[PDB]
Design a binder for this molecule. Structure first.
Ligand SMILES: N[C@@H](CCCC[NH3+])C(=O)O
Ligand SMILES: N[C@@H](CCCC[NH3+])C(=O)O
Ligand SMILES: [Mg+2]
Ligand SMILES: [Mg+2]
Ligand SMILES: [Mg+2]
Ligand SMILES: [Mg+2]
Ligand SMILES: [Mg+2]
Ligand SMILES: [Mg+2]
Ligand SMILES: [Mg+2]
Ligand SMILES: [Mg+2]
Ligand SMILES: [Mg+2]
Ligand SMILES: [Mg+2]
Ligand SMILES: [Mg+2]
Lengths: 296, 296
């Protein structure tokens, strides 16, 4: 199977005057490239998928593909939707516009059954010929892709090569790789990047890497080389920022941190997302002081 | 405040050859009207909001407004979205096309903060001049509209007159009506319709009423007339069907029941929703046999 692994970043989507700051977007991805990141994920949850139009969603995928051309960095395009027809459309767009693969979040709100999830991802996988990474985050979607369903999709579909797990369930992470060791388990929860990697996970799709790409990059590559003492040291070191970046709902804290670091021009969200509390703003600002934040 | 209360139905959306069966849709609404229902809710969760296009979502609102014209039955149009700009657009469409009010689900997937929920609903309420009913269903959205936020929105926004609660939290329903007794608490949980009404709730937005509109209507009207013994009697009798209609994720069981009752033409969903397992199909069919289903 073709895979996309290593250190990956769930890209924030900067706004300027209520519109996607496409030049800031390209600059941020380009900063990621220059700091050891292996792949970028445009328009995930962290990229405010929900509030982008289908045209802006597609524009962000294009900017990512263009910016990464001529580099080793891959584009794992965010292509999820709770409507199968729409997820297939995003998958086909990403394939036709040069993405190396797609991430596809489990359908949110409408809570499909395991059978429905299987048919949902199989239709997505059959629509294109690029790798497809499942994305399980039950706290946001209201549904869970079971281990059995994940393993079935991995074995039944050629392009489905693994899962990004944001479920706080290291037991499930053991379950997955003990019964199907060929799949690529990707950490979608920064605080436990090292435990997932140390159990045979092969990469991360990180929120923290938006702010500290070099540290997340080093952590992942240390761990992939089985340098667990160095990988764990970084993971323990990052715990404080990893947790404070979810003081409020992601991506509210990470965008707050990027703004405080001078990496984006304005602390702008699209409703229903909003600025952090004044208190959490100060808490984010205080935790950042213990870290070396790279500029451009 | 301007209000829409009483017995209300979260309308299923019948599909025929992958398209909205518009003549069946109108026929089902007239069946609701003829069985004592006070209002209909087009395109909720039960109406497969997630997988309808904007054109379809809008068409279903039109059919409901249009079919209920000349009757006492009101149209509480489903207008929720996890993107505030889209929720404002749906609200404005419903107002301009003759809906009596709108239902608006709390944003799903992107998990706004309480401040974000307030600004989300404030923007919706200011966009129209018709009543707005909040909709809290944390098991599907991943977020909760707190009691304080609901009460603030009720007091600060003219159009916001209550909430449809689908949270299995009768404590919160006491909390809401003890601190703000003027709001219209609406049950969004069929199994506990009577307990919510007996504590001062003023209506239901029912899934079960799709199949048994006469029974849900009678339950609500018994309770509103303070005949709690008869309202509880129907609630107790309906428990078995109320539960089996969620053996799988709504609206998979209710559409199965409507199809088994001969009320719709095909057991058709849009992916990622799918037909139930063969057990739950058989379980739904067996529970239905103990209830008298009205025809057309
Ligand atoms: N707000 C909708 C539409 C998003 C379209 C662009 N990703 C959703 O989250 O599914
Ligand atoms: N699937 C998207 C778009 C649906 C728009 C029509 N109701 C959502 O659930 O938000
Ligand atoms: Mg555009
Ligand atoms: Mg996705
Ligand atoms: Mg979508
Ligand atoms: Mg399809
Ligand atoms: Mg090495
Ligand atoms: Mg600054
Ligand atoms: Mg009436
Ligand atoms: Mg709604
Ligand atoms: Mg009253
Ligand atoms: Mg079966
Ligand atoms: Mg079964």
């Amino acid at each position: 199977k073709n895979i996309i692994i290593g250190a990956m970043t769930a890209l924030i989507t900067p706004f300027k005057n209520g519109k996607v700051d496409e030049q800031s977007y390209a600059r941020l991805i380009k900063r990621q490239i220059e700091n050891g990141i292996d792949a970028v994920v445009p328009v995930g949850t962290t990229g405010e998928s929900a509030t982008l139009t289908h045209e802006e969603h597609r524009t962000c995928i294009e900017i990512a593909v263009e910016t990464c051309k001529g580099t080793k960095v891959k584009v794992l395009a965010g292509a999820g939707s709770n409507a199968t027809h729409a997820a297939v459309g995003l998958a086909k767009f990403a394939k036709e516009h040069g993405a190396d693969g797609i991430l596809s979040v489990a359908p949110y709100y409408n809570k499909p059954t395991q059978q429905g999830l299987y048919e949902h991802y199989k239709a997505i996988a059959q629509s294109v010929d690029i790798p497809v990474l499942l994305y399980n985050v039950p706290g946001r979607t209201g549904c869970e892709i079971s281990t059995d369903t994940i393993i079935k999709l991995f074995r039944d579909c050629e392009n489905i090569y693994g899962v990004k797990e944001a479920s706080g369930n290291i037991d499930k992470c053991v379950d997955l790789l003990a019964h199907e060791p060929r799949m690529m388990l990707i950490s979608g929860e920064d605080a436990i990047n090292y435990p997932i990697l140390s159990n045979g996970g092969k990469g991360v799709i990180s929120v923290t890497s938006n702010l500290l790409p070099d540290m997340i990059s080093a952590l992942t590559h240390f761990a992939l080389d089985e340098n667990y003492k160095e990988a764990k040291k970084i993971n323990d070191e990052l715990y404080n920022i990893n947790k404070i970046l979810f003081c409020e709902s992601n991506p509210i804290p990470i965008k707050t941190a990027m703004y405080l670091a001078g990496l984006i021009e304005s602390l702008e969200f699209r409703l229903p997302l909003c600025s952090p509390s004044k208190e959490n703003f100060a808490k984010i600002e205080e935790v950042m002081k213990k870290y070396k934040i790279k500029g451009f």
